[PDB]
Amino acid sequence: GEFGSMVKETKFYDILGVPVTATDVEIKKAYRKCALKYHPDKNPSEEAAEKFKEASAAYEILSDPEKRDIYDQFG
């Protein structure tokens, strides 16, 4: 139900499968693999779809170094 740690660090990196110190390329490929591997159009699982959605959000911030730093520091 409830989750601890208000500060969210590394979760998006972990979800994509990239290090905290990840670069844009690592981020892109992680997105590519996460989306391709668990996309809902081939992977019917809800969780797979969840992974896709999380991957896309991770991508939207992480694929942007500025956003990435913003995420990294603000947590």
How would you describe this structure in keywords?
mainly alpha, 4 helices, chaperone, J-domain
Write a concise synopsis of the structure shown.
This protein has 75 residues and is mainly alpha-helical.
Structural features, described:
It is flat, with a radius of gyration of 13 Å. Helix content is 64%, strand content 0%. The protein has one domain (1-75). The protein is built from 4 helices and no strands. The chain has helices at 11-16, 24-38, 46-62, 65-74. It is mainly α and 75 residues long. Helix 2 runs antiparallel to helix 3. The two termini are 21 Å apart. Residues 9-75 form the J domain. This is Mitochondrial protein import protein MAS5.
**Helix and strand composition category:** mainly alpha
What distance separates the N and C termini?
21 Å
Radius of gyration: 13 Å
Beta content comes to: under 5%
Number of domains: 1
Largest sheet: none
Secondary-structure element sequence? HHHH
Helix content: 55-70%
Count of extended strands: 0
Please work out how many helical segments DSSP would assign: 4
Subunit structure: Homodimer. Interacts with HAP1. Component of the HMC including HAP1, SRO9 and YDJ1.
Subcellular location: Cytoplasm; Cytoplasm, Perinuclear region
Domain J: 9-75
Organism: Saccharomyces cerevisiae (strain ATCC 204508 / S288c)
